[PDB]
Amino acid sequence: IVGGYTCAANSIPYQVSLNSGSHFCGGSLINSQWVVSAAHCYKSRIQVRLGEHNIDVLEGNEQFINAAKIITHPNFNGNTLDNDIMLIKLSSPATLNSRVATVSLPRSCAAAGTECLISGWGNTKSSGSSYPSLLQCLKAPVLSDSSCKSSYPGQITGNMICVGFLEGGKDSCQGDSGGPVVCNGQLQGIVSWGYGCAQKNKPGVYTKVCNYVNWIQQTIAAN
Numbered sequence: 001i002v003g004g005y006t007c008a009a010n011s012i013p014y015q016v017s018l019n020s021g022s023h024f025c026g027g028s029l030i031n032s033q034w035v036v037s038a039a040h041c042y043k044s045r046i047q048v049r050l051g052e053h054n055i056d057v058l059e060g061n062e063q064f065i066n067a068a069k070i071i072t073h074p075n076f077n078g079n080t081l082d083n084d085i086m087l088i089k090l091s092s093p094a095t096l097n098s099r100v101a102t103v104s105l106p107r108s109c110a111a112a113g114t115e116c117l118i119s120g121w122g123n124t125k126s127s128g129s130s131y132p133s134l135l136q137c138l139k140a141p142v143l144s145d146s147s148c149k150s151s152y153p154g155q156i157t158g159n160m161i162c163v164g165f166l167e168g169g170k171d172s173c174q175g176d177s178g179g180p181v182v183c184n185g186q187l188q189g190i191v192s193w194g195y196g197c198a199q200k201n202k203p204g205v206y207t208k209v210c211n212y213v214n215w216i217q218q219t220i221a222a223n
């Protein structure tokens, strides 16, 4: 997260870290047994780390649970990034408490201008690299579906939204991938793609979660 602030510890209780020797992507806990993330985050072996704030120190609220199943969207396209969504089944249920909690899926799509919270352990520098120990947070609005489409001509499908700031300096980045965009208590976005990060007129593009609730529920019920 570039241009963000350090979240209060455990204040984003649905945020997970996907780990494969180190942190590599975010995700969101949506059921005691299921995390949703981005298909471009796929790895065949993943440990889900719940209840984190400092990913470099055991602080006592962590639950480390291996992925039992990893299911990418059958229509994920690695070129266009359409359908950039993935589900991970935990090998045991997360134990839900104040620090490890589910986030609601969308009841509807979010209006343009809706304020959202984007979070993750991704790069924090707009130039160079600094990867944080502590979870970072960013408040950002859903952008006009036009301001999104003008930024990336011909590249925004109906399964993508832009959330962010056209002036730059405030965006998700590498390592935030797969993490949450939560607006009015609902998971509306998954960190997906962009052109670098925090550049002027290149806002973050996010998988539009309100199109996937049936896919999510059907996959959960079948697996």
Ligand SMILES: NC(=[NH2+])NCCCO
Residues within 6 Å of the ligand: 171, 172, 173, 174, 175, 176, 177, 178, 191, 192, 193, 194, 195, 196, 197, 198, 203, 204, 205
């Ligand atoms: N604005 C961004 N490039 N964010 C997405 C990072 C790549 O998943």
Ligand SMILES: [Ca+2]
Residues within 6 Å of the ligand: 052, 053, 054, 055, 056, 057, 058, 059, 060, 062
């Ligand atoms: Ca920790």
